[PDB]
Design a binder for this molecule. Sequence first.
Ligand SMILES: [Cl-]
Ligand SMILES: [Cl-]
Ligand SMILES: [Cl-]
Ligand SMILES: [Cl-]
Ligand SMILES: [Cl-]
Ligand code: NA
Length: 129
Amino acid sequence: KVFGRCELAAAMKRHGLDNYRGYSLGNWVCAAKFESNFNTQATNRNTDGSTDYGILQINSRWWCNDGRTPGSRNLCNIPCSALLSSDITASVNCAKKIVSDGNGMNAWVAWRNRCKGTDVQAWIRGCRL
Ligand SMILES: [Cl-]
Ligand SMILES: [Cl-]
Ligand SMILES: [Cl-]
Ligand SMILES: [Cl-]
Ligand SMILES: [Cl-]
Ligand code: NA
């Protein structure tokens, strides 16, 4: 599924992410956009045999189990496949654990390169929230 911006703002808001660890909402939506283009189904292979999955491009190295990442913690205790679903619960529930792990949203390279320090509010402008 290929989210609306305002639409996705509302679901993440819904599932507890607005202000989660002081990361306001526009961050989450900004991260989402440059990581996956708002597409539940993005997968991108990493040079270290690992794969990034779903809206937030979550890593199979530490967070999910995808069955082909020889070295792998499954810290979110979930198959990577469920991060590609159209319901973002799994994707949201895993990212709360990432943002808490003692690096915050710098865990999302795109967030760090594309959202950090910007007017992240502009990504919820006009959205009925
Ligand atoms: Cl915001
Ligand atoms: Cl995508
Ligand atoms: Cl997803
Ligand atoms: Cl990665
Ligand atoms: Cl922080
Ligand atoms: Na694993």
